[PDB]
C-alpha cells in the first residue's frame, strides 16, 4: 500500500516540529507502520525522534514515542494510563552515528500489528526486537491523543526528550507491513554483514572476528558462532569461516572450521531480562577464540582455536593439568572411562586407546575426528537441544544419534575437563577444513593449556616461520613452527601481570623485527619487540594516547604495505575509552627508523565516541583498502548481552584515516 503521510527534510535542533494537522486525522485502524530515515551524529543523552501524545494536563503518561540514547540504543514507549499500559521495548547498540566523517542515514521501520499483537523494530535492515503482548495497545488508540511530534514528545504542553539530529524522510502506513515488504525498503548502510542470524551456522550470535588476506587475493574471515547467547564457554560455540574474492564486496555462505555435534545447532532467542540472561548452556563442548595464518611454503591456510570439553569454560577448567600424560618425551591425551574415578587410559599412536593401570591396549580406538570406535565400529551418543519453554533453560535429548566424541558429556571415554588448543588446515583457501588436531602441551604435564590470542598469526615475510601468540598467567607464550604447522615450539615472554587476559597481536616492522601489541589490566595497550624472529623478547612498554578500560579489550594490528608521509606504517584497531568498550578507532603509527619507535600520528574515529566498539579484526585488502570486521557494541557490558547482527564489516581507504 501507499503512505497516509510522507514528509522529509526535517531539522531537529532542540526544537520539536508539530505535524499533528498533517497526520492525526490520517491515522485509522489499529495497525500502523512507521518508516523513518534519520541522522544523529551528535545526539542528546536521550531523545525522541517521533511522538504521538495526549498533551493535556493530567495525561503525562499517555503517549507513543520512538526514542534513542547516545549509547546507540533504540526503542519505543506505548503508554495509556486509563488502560494501565506502560510498554517499553528497546535494544542497545542498534544505530550508526558517523562513517568516514559523515553522519549516517539510519533506516528505521517500526511495525505495530494488532492482528498478531506484536511490535517489531528494524534498524538498517536488522530486526532489533519483536515483542508479542497479551493486551495490545494500538499506537493511535491512546486515550486523548492530540499531538503528532518530531524531535520531542509533547507532555502537558512541554517538550520532553528534545532531539538533536535530522529526519530526512518519514512515512506512516495504516497497515502492519510484512517482513517481506520490509526487506524491499532501500537502505543506506555504511556496513555489511559477513556472518548474520539465520545464515548457514544457525547461530543467533557471533563474537571474536578475524580477518586475513591470502596471497591469492582471497580475504578470509573466522568467527565464534555462538549458540547460547554471546556468553564465553561454557556454551555451545563453533568456529565458522567465510571468504571474499572481490576485495570484501561480497562474502561466501559460512562453513565450519571447527564444530562439535553433541548439541544441535539451534537459532535461539536468548533472554535479555535480568532474571534469565545469565542462562548458559552447561553440557556442551565448544570451540572459542580463533586465529588464522597462511603458510607460504605449503600454501595451506592454518586455523587454531581454544577447545573446551562439555560444560567447560575458562573459570571451571582444571588449571594445573594439561590433560596429557608424558611418557618419555612424548605427550598422550588422557581419557577416563565411564564409571572410573580417575583417568586410567591414554590415546597412543594411531588412536589406540591404551590402558595405564594394566599397561594393555584395549579394543577401543580414537579416529581423526576424536570420535570413539569399538573394534572399528562407530559408537554414538544422543544429541541435546535447548529450550526455555518451562520458563528456564532446559537441555534435553532430542532423539538424534551423532558420533561419540571424547569431548562430549555422554561419551564412554572423556578427556580431562580443561582447556586445549586445536589446529585445522585448509588446502583450498577456506572452501573446506580438515579435522582438527590437538596441539601438545607447552608448559608441562601439570599446567592447563595457554589461551590463543584471537585474530591473526604471523607469517614472517623472509622465512617459513609461523607464529601464533598465546597467553597464560605471567607471560605471553608464542607458538612457533618452521615446518608448516607440523611441529611447534614455544617462546615464553614474561609480562608484569598475573592472571591477565593478555590478548596479543603481532606486526613485522622489518625483516625479523616483530612488535607485539597486547591487552593489559592497566588501562594502556602494552607492547614488546623481538629482533630475532621471535626467539627472544624485550621488556614491556606501553602506548600513551590510547585509553582502555581496567579490564581491557583485544587490539588488532597490521603492518601497512604502503608508505605514509614517507614512513613505514602500522595500524591499530581498538576502542579508545577508559569507561567502556566504545569509541572505536583505527590509530595510524609511523615507524622511526632510528630506534623502531612509533609515532601515533593519526586517529580515525570509527563511529561516535559513545557508540560501542569491542573486539576487532583488520586486514589490508589486496587493493590497499582496509577491511574492518568488529563487534559494534559493548561486549563487556551486562546490559548488551545477546544482541544479533552487531558484528559488522566496513571498508576504508588510507585517506579516510588521515
> Which residues does residue 529 pair with via DSSP β-bridges, in sequence order?
515
DSSP state of 434: P
Q: What is the CA radius of gyration of the chain?
A: 27
Distance CA 239, CA 178 (A): 33
Distance CA 541, CA 518 (A): 10
Distance CA 86, CA 77 (A): 7
Distance CA 655, CA 640 (A): 33
Confirm whether residue 578 is marked as ligand binding.
Answer: no
**What is 3-40 written as a DSSP string?**
-SEEEEEEEEESS-EE-HHHHGGG--SS-EEEEEEEE-
Confirm whether residue 69 is marked as ligand binding.
Answer: no
Q: Cβ atoms within 10 A of the Cβ of 364, count?
A: 21
Residue 574 near residue 617 (C-beta atoms within 8 A): no
C-alpha cell at 408: 562430549
3-state SS, residue 542: strand
How remote is the C-alpha of 222 from its chain's centroid? 11
3-state SS, residue 517: strand
C-alpha cell at 427: 588446502
C-alpha cell at 291: 586465529
Confirm whether residue 207 is marked as ligand binding.
Answer: yes
Q: Give 265's contacts (C-beta < 8 A, 6+ positions apart).
A: 201, 202, 203, 227, 236, 238
Residue where the block lists cell 557494541: 633
Kindly list the catalytic residues. Answer: 232, 503, 615
Residue 509 near residue 527 (C-beta atoms within 8 A): no
C-alpha cell at 418: 580443561
How remote is the C-alpha of 104 from its chain's centroid? 22
3-state SS, residue 180: helix
Q: Cβ atoms within 10 A of the Cβ of 115, count?
A: 9
Sequence ranges of the binding site for substrate = 207, 519, 581
Amino acid at each position: 500500500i501507499s503512505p497516509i503521510f510522507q514528509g522529509g527534510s526535517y531539522q531537529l535542533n532542540n526544537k520539536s516540529i508539530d505535524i499533528s494537522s498533517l497526520l492525526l486525522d490520517k491515522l485509522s485502524g489499529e495497525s500502523q507502520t512507521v518508516v523513518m530515515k534519520f541522522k544523529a551524529d551528535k545526539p542528546n543523552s536521550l531523545q525522541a525522534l517521533f511522538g504521538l501524545s495526549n498533551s493535556k494536563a493530567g495525561f503525562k503518561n499517555n503517549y507513543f514515542s520512538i526514542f534513542m540514547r547516545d549509547s546507540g540504543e533504540i526503542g519505543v514507549e506505548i503508554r495509556d494510563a486509563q488502560k494501565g499500559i506502560n510498554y517499553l521495548f528497546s535494544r542497545p547498540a542498534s544505530l550508526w552515528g558517523k562513517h568516514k566523517g559523515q553522519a549516517v542515514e539510519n533506516t528505521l521501520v517500526f511495525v505495530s500489528d494488532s492482528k498478531d499483537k506484536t511490535y517489531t523494530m528494524y534498524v538498517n535492515g536488522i530486526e532489533v526486537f519483536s515483542e508479542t503482548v497479551d493486551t495490545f495497545l494500538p499506537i493511535s488508540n491512546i486515550n486523548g491523543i492530540d499531538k503528532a511530534t518530531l524531535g520531542a514528545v509533547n507532555r502537558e504542553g512541554k517538550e520532553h526528550y528534545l532531539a538533536k539530529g535530522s529526519i530526512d524522510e518519514i512515512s506512516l502506513f495504516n497497515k502492519a507491513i510484512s517482513d517481506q515488504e520490509v526487506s524491499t525498503i532501500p537502505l543506506s548502510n555504511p556496513f555489511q554483514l559477513i556472518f548474520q542470524s539465520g545464515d548457514s551456522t544457525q547461530a543467533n550470535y557471533f563474537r571474536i572476528p578475524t580477518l586475513y588476506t591470502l596471497s591469492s587475493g582471497r580475504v578470509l574471515s573466522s568467527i565464534d558462532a555462538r549458540y547460547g547467547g554471546t556468553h564465553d564457554s561454557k556454551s555451545k560455540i563453533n568456529i565458522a569461516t567465510s571468504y571474499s574474492d572481490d576485495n570484501g564486496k561480497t562474502w561466501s555462505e559460512p562453513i565450519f572450521a571447527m564444530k562439535f555435534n553433541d548439541y544441535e545447532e539451534q537459532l535461539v532467542y536468548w533472554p535479555r531480562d535480568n532474571k534469565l540472561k545469565n542462562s548458559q548452556i552447561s553440557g556442551s563442548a565448544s570451540f572459542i577464540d580463533s586465529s588464522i595464518v597462511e603458510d607460504k611454503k605449503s600454501g595451506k591456510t592454518i586455523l587454531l582455536a581454544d577447545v573446551m570439553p562439555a560444560g567447560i569454560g575458562n573459570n571451571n577448567a582444571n588449571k594445573a593439568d594439561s590433560g596429557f600424560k608424558e611418557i618419555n618425551g612424548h605427550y598422550y591425551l588422557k581419557l577416563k572411562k565411564n564409571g572410573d574415578n580417575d583417568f586410567r587410559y591414554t590415546v597412543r599412536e594411531n588412536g589406540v586407546v591404551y590402558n595405564e593401570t594394566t599397561n594393555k591396549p584395549t579394543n577401543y580406538t580414537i579416529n581423526d575426528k576424536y570420535e570413539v570406535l569399538e573394534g572399528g565400529k562407530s559408537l554414538t551418543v544422543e544429541q541435546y537441544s535447548v529450550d526455555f519453554d518451562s520458563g528456564s533453560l532446559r537441555e534435553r535429548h532430542n532423539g538424534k544419534q551423532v558420533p561419540m566424541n571424547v569431548f562430549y558429556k555422554d561419551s564412554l571415554f572423556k578427556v580431562t575437563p580443561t582447556n586445549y588448543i586445536a589446529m585445522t588446515t585448509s588446502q583450498n583457501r577456506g572452501e573446506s577444513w580438515e579435522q582438527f588436531k590437538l596441539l601438545p602441551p607447552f608448559l608441562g604435564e601439570k599446567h592447563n593449556g595457554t589461551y590463543l590470542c584471537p585474530g591473526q598469526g604471523l607469517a614472517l615475510k623472509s622465512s617459513n616461520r609461523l607464529i601464533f601468540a598465546t597467553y597464560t598467567s605471567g607471560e605471553l607464550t608464542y607458538l612457533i613452527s618452521d615446518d608448516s604447522g607440523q611441529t611447534w615450539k614455544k617462546s615464553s615472554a614474561s609480562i608484569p601481570f598475573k592472571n591477565a587476559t593478555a590478548e596479543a597481536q603481532m606486526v613485522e616492522l622489518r625483516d625479523g623485527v616483530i612488535r607485539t601489541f597486547f591487552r593489559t589490566t592497566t588501562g594502556k595497550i602494552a607492547y614488546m619487540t623481538s629482533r630475532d624472529s621471535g626467539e627472544t623478547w624485550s621488556k614491556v612498554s606501553y602506548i600513551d594516547g590510547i585509553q582502555q578500560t581496567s579490564y581491557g579489550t583485544q587490539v588488532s594490528a597490521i603492518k601497512y604495505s604502503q608508505l605514509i608521509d614517507g614512513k613505514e606504517a602500522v595500524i591499530l584497531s581498538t576502542p579508545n575509552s577508559r569507561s567502556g568498550r566504545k569509541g572505536g578507532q583505527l590509530v595510524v603509527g609511523l615507524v622511526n627508523k632510528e630506534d623502531d619507535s612509533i609515532d601515533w600520528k593519526y586517529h580515525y574515529d570509527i563511529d561516535l565516541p559513545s557508540y560501542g566498539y569491542a573486539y576487532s579484526a583488520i586486514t589490508e585488502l589486496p587493493n590497499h583498502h582496509i577491511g574492518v570486521l568488529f563487534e559494534k557494541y559493548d561486549s563487556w557490558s551486562r546490559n548488551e548481552l545477546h544482541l544479533s547482527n552487531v558484528v559488522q564489516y566496513i571498508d576504508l581507504e588510507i585517506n579516510d584515516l588521515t
